[PDB]
Ligand binder design. Structure first.
Ligand SMILES: Cc1csc(CNC(=O)c2ccn[nH]2)n1
Ligand SMILES: [Zn+2]
Ligand SMILES: [Zn+2]
Ligand SMILES: [Zn+2]
Length: 459
């Protein structure tokens, strides 16, 4: 059960308007053949063009929704739409391009997929709501064969060039004209009633149906993200490292310890309500405070309602002390809170577009996050940058320029001159903070938080 057997049945009902008379009895083997591809009993790493839902979930970064709309066929021009917002018109002689022959369209497809996917994945997974034209058009821009490696590097080949007869990955495909060994999955095989728009609109109001192929390509990938990440959650699936994953995770842990430790020193709360991960650990283990944990898994659909998290009868008095919501996405935070909330609008190789304004944040594990909403933070303010340290001023053991900063809250800065140790530590902390912010995280705190209250912890 590693790959999808070519002898598996393919439901052809959704294909019979573009392909009238299509046999009801159909396998992947006969379908790939009908599409104009020959597999030739090849045991060479590419057993099927189509993959399982489980293999698709493991390769979510490679997903590219794809739709082809005809006219009134090899007589009519076709509009090719991708979930990148691109629409290309192919002739057989929201970015809208006028009609061009396949020999130039294929060149543009290779460029577009390579630029979208080079920093995301080692492949492309065409996400379909198959009606016929998208499958019969693949022979015009896709070549298949044995698994290969890039001509300029060790990555698997994703493109082919008829000009030089060579193969390339997404990073080395400039000038390549064919998509090599792509993958694909037909969402319509999962058991749905009604068309694409009616199933998509049950869960999402952010994507419309402007009647261009890219709108359908966008809805198809959104519907697949909903089915695989919103209504079905698998936090056991691991995803490869493609960027700053480790630095960001280390930075988040550093910022969390810093912000919570300073909030407890500045306001001396007697109790802290830690709402979120059921496996959470005290981020400030030495703090005096009464630490109380409340379990809530990451919400992937809609943000938690504070009324359901807090009410229906625990300290019961969440109004006492401070509440900590570290990536616990709620509709409206209470005024006495410390909050880390992921901003779904952030553009990054870790953040993929999601369902209903939400985003799919993929960092070791895939987490669909509900749409960022500025009104969740109305009882709070943005947490300002600051570095706090009560550790001794001692170097131990990278050349220096003296640090001058009003936000370096240390004994040495109180005393007029930041020491080398606290200056190095401040700069490392500022780097970790900037990495977390730029990765998409936002920090919020109760309105009374004032770092001026940290200076008297050095007396
Ligand atoms: C050349 C050509 C063929 S189809 C087309 C315009 N697209 C649509 O009509 C449509 C319907 C749904 N999505 N797209 N242009
Ligand atoms: Zn390469
Ligand atoms: Zn959608
Ligand atoms: Zn110091």
């Amino acid at each position: 059960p590693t790959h999808l057997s070519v002898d598996t049945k393919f439901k052809t009902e959704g294909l019979c308007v573009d392909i009238p008379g299509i046999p009801k009895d159909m396998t992947y083997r006969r379908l790939i053949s009908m599409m104009g591809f020959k597999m030739n009993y090849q045991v060479n790493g590419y057993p099927n063009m189509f993959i399982t839902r489980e293999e698709a979930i493991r390769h979510v970064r490679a997903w590219i929704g794809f739709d082809v709309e005809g006219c009134h066929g090899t007589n009519l021009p076709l509009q090719l739409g991708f979930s990148t917002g691109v629409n290309l018109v192919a002739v057989p002689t929201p970015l809208m391009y006028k009609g061009l022959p396949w020999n130039v369209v294929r060149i543009k497809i290779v460029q577009m997929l390579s630029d979208t996917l080079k920093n995301l994945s080692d492949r492309v997974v065409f996400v379909l709501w198959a009606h016929g034209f998208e499958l019969t058009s693949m022979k015009y821009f896709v070549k298949i064969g044995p698994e290969r490696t890039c001509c300029l590097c060790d990555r698997r080949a994703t493109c082919f060039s008829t000009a030089s007869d060579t193969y390339a990955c997404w990073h080395h495909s400039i000038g390549f004209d064919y998509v090599y060994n792509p993958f694909m999955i037909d969402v319509q095989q999962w058991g749905f009633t009604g068309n694409l728009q009616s199933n998509h609109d049950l869960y999402c109001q952010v994507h419309g149906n402007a009647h261009v192929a890219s709108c359908d390509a966008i809805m198809t990938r959104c519907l697949a993200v909903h089915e695989c990440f919103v209504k079905r959650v698998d936090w056991t699936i691991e995803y490869p490292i493609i960027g700053d994953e480790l630095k960001i995770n280390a930075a988040c842990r550093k910022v969390q310890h810093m912000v919570v430790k300073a909030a407890l020193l500045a306001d001396k709360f007697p109790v802290l309500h830690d709402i979120g991960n059921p496996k959470a650990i005290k981020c400030v283990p030495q703090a005096d405070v009464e630490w109380k944990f409340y379990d809530a898994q990451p919400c992937s659909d809609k943000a938690y309602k504070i009324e359901e998290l807090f009410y229906s009868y625990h300290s019961d008095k969440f109004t006492d002390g401070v509440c900590l919501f570290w990536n616990c996405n709620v509709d409206r935070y209470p005024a006495n809170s410390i909050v880390c909330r992921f901003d779904t609008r952030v553009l990054s190789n870790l953040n993929l577009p999601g369902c209903d304004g939400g985003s799919l944040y993929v960092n070791k594990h895939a987490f669909h996050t509900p749409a960022f909403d500025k009104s969740a933070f109305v009882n709070l303010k943005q947490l300002p940058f600051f570095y706090y340290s009560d550790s001794p001023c001692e170097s131990h053991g990278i050349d220096y320029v003296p640090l001058k900063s009003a936000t370096c809250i240390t004994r040495c800065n109180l005393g007029g001159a930041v020491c080398r140790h606290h200056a190095n530590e401040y700069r490392l902390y500022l780097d970790a903070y900037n990495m977390m912010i730029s990765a998409g995280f936002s920090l919020w705190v109760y309105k009374q938080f004032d770092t001026y209250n940290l200076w008297n912890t050095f007396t």
